[PDB]
Design a protein around this ligand. Sequence first.
Ligand SMILES: [Ca+2]
Ligand SMILES: [Ca+2]
Lengths: 570, 570
Amino acid sequence: SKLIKGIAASDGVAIAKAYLLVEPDLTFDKNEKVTDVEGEVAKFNSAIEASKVELTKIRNNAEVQLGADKAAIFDAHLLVLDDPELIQPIQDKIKNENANAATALTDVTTQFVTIFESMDNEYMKERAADIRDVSKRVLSHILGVELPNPSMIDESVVIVGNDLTPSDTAQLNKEFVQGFATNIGGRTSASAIMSRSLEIPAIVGTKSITQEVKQGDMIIVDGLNGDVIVNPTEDELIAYQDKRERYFADKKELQKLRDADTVTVDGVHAELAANIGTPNDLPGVIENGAQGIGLYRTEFLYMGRDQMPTEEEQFEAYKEVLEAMGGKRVVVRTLDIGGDKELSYLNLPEEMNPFLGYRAIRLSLAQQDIFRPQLRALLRASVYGKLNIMFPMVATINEFREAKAILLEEKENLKNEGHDISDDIELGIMVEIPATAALADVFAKEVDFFSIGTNDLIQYTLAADRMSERVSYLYQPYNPSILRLVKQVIEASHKEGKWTGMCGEMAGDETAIPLLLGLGLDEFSMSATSILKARRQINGLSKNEMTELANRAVDCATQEEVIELVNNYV
Amino acid sequence: SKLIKGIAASDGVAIAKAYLLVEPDLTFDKNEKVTDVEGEVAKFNSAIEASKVELTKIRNNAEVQLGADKAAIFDAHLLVLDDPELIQPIQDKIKNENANAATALTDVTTQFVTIFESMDNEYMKERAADIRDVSKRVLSHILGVELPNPSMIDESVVIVGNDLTPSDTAQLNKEFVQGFATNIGGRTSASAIMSRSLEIPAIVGTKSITQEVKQGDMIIVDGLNGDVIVNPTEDELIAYQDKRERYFADKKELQKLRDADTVTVDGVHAELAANIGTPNDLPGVIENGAQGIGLYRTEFLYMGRDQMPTEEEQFEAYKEVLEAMGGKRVVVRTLDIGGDKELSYLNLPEEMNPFLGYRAIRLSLAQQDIFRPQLRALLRASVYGKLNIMFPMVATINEFREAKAILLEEKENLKNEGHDISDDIELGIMVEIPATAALADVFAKEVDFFSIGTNDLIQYTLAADRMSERVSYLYQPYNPSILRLVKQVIEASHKEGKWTGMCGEMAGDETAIPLLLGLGLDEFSMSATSILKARRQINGLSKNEMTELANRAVDCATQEEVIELVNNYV
Ligand SMILES: [Ca+2]
Ligand SMILES: [Ca+2]
């Protein structure tokens, strides 16, 4: 009776009555002069403590109950409640201006949030989001009102609301909550990530859903194709019941693939790997039948520490992974901290444009006392599992020759000391610089393998920063220009008997896979949560047919042409 | 007897006795507490006025005597002497700290210069340079000492010194000054630009020249190949006398080319054009036998004004040029103000990385009320000369389709009003985005012509900012990656009967020309001062032979390989 399209954020088909997530009434008298200043201050302080304690409960029992690393967002919320930068100005305003806590809180929050959100930085945009969640909570206490939550208490419902706060999603009881649909939110948001973790169907960013649903209405959430249906007709209910069952069936046959090999209908093999940033992501990897690790981000090791990680710490983490993989490929990426990142412990110039300047291997070279410890640690850890090393931001040849020369320096350094190493350690490069693709066949002669970082490559090839909203529209992964460089790299590697993988998010995308297949892509690195689906898709395809499809795409004139070719190909 | 290599900054061979440019003794007692504060302040103020008047003489008679636009640097020096930001702190320091003017001047200057120089910005680096020149002058007055100058007074000398200040070079009397050689300085410095204007042989940045020469020594300056010779042997003198004469002969035969056509030995034509940023550069253009204008930078029109230029002003300037060219091609470039530029009158976000974000046609689109006036002005001016329009930073197709659609909007807007236009106006694009090269054959179908901006293309392809000294080494114009994109663009244009030009500095380079020839380059845009030399070189070459040379270059592995192939090709 009513179809509302949105962004699918979690697979599955949920069918239950609508539960409306009612929000607090945060209305209050502005500029109401307070009689008791110290009283008003204590009122605001009480709210802080009350919120602080509530968030400690949510946090600690979020982990131990569902991922010990997912509760990190809450550690980010509690931090906000401890930041003098944010609290002092509120207290100052109440004291000096005699403003009520409600107004002082609003004004200061609005000030900070506006500055951070109108700012081309991920971390800054993240803090604004957190400050939003906590201010609402704190304000709620101040006005003597309550936030929403999960206290049902029956029955099977579909949560309908504007947006689910990270605190709400962590409180969801999959026993009753069949799924949710909200006006706003993102496929990549923290709450929407906890969603697919709880395998709870969800579609997000619909804008209108809240105004389209009355409490008690039957709701179906098609997290498969991303559309919501309010008040289903008899025929629609019957049809989606079957779809929900097929979903469960597919889940079954999907688990019989965890140990199955990835082979196209016409005998062409591929390798499905997983991208990990922390050794806490290992469980998910083996569980999802991964053919190794194609991207191991080692920035998490260097970040958030007093001093840079010793060779020992590193060796410990590398050894652990190589073991956990029992001989399966592990591609470790040299330190590549984004020019626009933290690192509040290192010496680095402000640089007009960080994303073009001193970062990755550029930093690595000329800093061989901070880049070398990593290498000597990788060489000692190699005696365990199958190790691959690769350098980020290699734009030129003799850059690769210098780094490789540094590596062989250590293979000699350790040996003489008494340390044994493995003689088979592949050495490749992270392909993000367009220049490196332009000369692929030259690099292919010297490099053991390529792995494309679409995220970077797209920004450099099209010359636009995805962070800057002004030109973010130029983040076009299905752009023919990109496809051509991709193909160029792949062709070159096979010309030398090398292989090309892709550890950018595009590799795990169910719509970009058939193209990459047809281009000849050897390895697909993705989130472990997508490996099984990729294997199912690839095993049912013919490289021959996808080759012709790809050769039509590279000759398209716009991304719009490509996306349509793909969606309606015969 | 002594050969000192350096950077040639001006052609010619000068042979005369050494005149050493003696510098002032700026030594003084530091932290010498002053007795009379108001006296010391007036002492410093006197120096300011004395310098100010000296620089007004240098400035106004610099123009009217040699270019009315070259004296701009001095307008930049006088401005410094008027900047309260720089003066107040000196006066403040003398008053509060009782420091002598000499120390107060030194400390504040050192502070400002350090901050500006250690800063990845051209304008900021330019101000530091100016502050250096003026502080030295001002300090000179304060210490009761004199700066160097040109008061000879015989005879023919070669100026030897550490560096020539913009004030010294403008005082040079070509009647006596045969040429100069300095320890430091740049081929692109203002003073070194006035040098080639006065056709006075010069080599710069030798580091050692000052310590290698005694007053009165015979000096020969080979501004042709860039080496200095101190105390020439009898045989060397004889040989360089002949070289000086050949130089004069070559000058002669070079003027017989101003009206000659550019044609290779094997009948292959090319077009040598000139890059102009201001209509004051026209005289140089026609004088140097240019085949039109391949790059007309229109940023000088928008910059340094209260409000953006009306359609009228623009139409006036475009009409003037098109006339001055009597039917010769004029390629005008749409407004492209660098993200890291002034524009202290426009609304633009700070943006983390300007060089990737909101600039050129990106800005143009979404601002059709500030981009349209230019177009409607170009359409009305087209009825005069041969007009070509081209858009900067076009990374994608439908960007070009949108802009072209805007253009045709105006061709309709004017027509109905009563304004007549020319039906033949070519419309091409500035090729700086690597993505645009990757899809050249698609763009070639829709675009009338390509023109490569190496300056930008090199930075995007290799992903490094030339301004940032940390990664500036990646500004590699002879890199095989670049050559390949260049070739790719050229091939595509000819496949559609289009043409490709290059208005980057590389096009006018006597070492990059034979390569570009062999690549098939149709048009070469450069500084008018290089056109004649390019014609001489090209007219003496065979495209056939340079084709094979180019095809060996594109398959090189590094810039070092390419630069050597070129220098020692047979
Ligand atoms: Ca290099
Ligand atoms: Ca576009």
